[PDB]
């Protein structure tokens, strides 16, 4: 996260860290949507152009964390994956359309002050809140800057970061990039002349873009950090997977009933 701030303890209890077993490294962010399901971006698991193709045995899910590097004994919880599901129409070949994936945990996680699921939007909540100008919130342990000299510090935060950003009008999103945009994505961030700034960055991928409903005071995950050109560059915006538009697929693989 660039131009963000330290998160408060328990401010984002649905935040999940996708961690590679070996070499031990942070891969992406993710979100907890129930006791046995985690939501993330498909590009975190599968991206052929760079020979990235992870299986359930390759990673661990870390829930309830605040610190990025420490093993928060007695607080964070670790889970193994039973199975991964990538959207069958995930378009890694051209524009990352349908950049979404579900991960089933081997055993249900127990909730606590620091671990709690986020809600998925219903048709009307999405309708009321997904409007240009409305702000959402993005969190992650990703890089603090697009680039920074090596050995001279670390562009990595020691604690979860947070930043609030406004949803941007579709024509402005489209006119900011050469990539072909679809209805399954929306973009967010400040415009060059709005003064304030901020963006997600490398390492933040797969994390949640959430909004608080003023109708029922609940937090809803409206997007997933998908892609962006550089980090926090003027004239550029971060793009997110439109969760509500892919909800039927989500509900389908869950068959919770």
């Amino acid at each position: 996260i660039v131009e963000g701030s330290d998160a408060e303890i328990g401010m984002s209890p649905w935040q999940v860290m996708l961690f590679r077993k070996s070499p031990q490294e942070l891969l992406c962010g993710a979100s907890l949507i129930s006791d046995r399901w985690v939501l993330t971006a498909a590009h975190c698991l599968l991206y052929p152009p760079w020979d990235k193709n992870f299986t359930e045995n390759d990673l661990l899910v870390r829930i309830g964390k605040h610190s990025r590097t420490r093993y928060e004994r007695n607080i964070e919880k670790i889970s193994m994956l039973e199975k991964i599901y990538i959207h069958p129409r995930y378009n890694w070949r051209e524009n990352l359309d349908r950049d979404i994936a579900l991960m089933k945990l081997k055993k249900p996680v127990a909730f606590s002050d620091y671990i709690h699921p986020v809600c998925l939007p219903d048709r009307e909540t999405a309708a009321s809140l997904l409007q240009a100008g409305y702000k959402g919130r993005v969190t992650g342990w990703g890089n603090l800057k697009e680039t920074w000299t090596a050995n001279v510090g670390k562009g990595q935060p020691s604690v979860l970061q947070v930043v609030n950003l406004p949803i941007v009008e579709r024509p402005v999103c489209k006119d900011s990039t050469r990539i072909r945009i679809t209805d399954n994505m929306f973009c967010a961030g400040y415009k060059p002349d709005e003064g304030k700034r901020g963006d997600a960055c490398e390492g933040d991928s797969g994390g949640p873009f959430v909004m608080k409903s003023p109708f029922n005071n609940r937090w809803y995950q409206m997007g997933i950090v998908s892609w962006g050109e550089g980090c926090d560059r003027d004239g550029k915006y971060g793009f997110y997977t439109h969760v509500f538009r892919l909800k039927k697929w989500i509900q389908k693989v869950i068959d919770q009933f």
Partner: peptide, 27 residues
């Protein structure tokens, strides 16, 4: 069911440092 209500915030009727910034933008 109990989704989106944080144990340390909504559940206790406490607000985090910047959530008001979101609500003030909803209109």
């Amino acid at each position: 069911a109990d989704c989106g209500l944080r144990p340390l915030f909504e559940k206790k009727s406490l607000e985090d440092k910047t959530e008001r910034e979101l609500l003030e933008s909803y209109i």
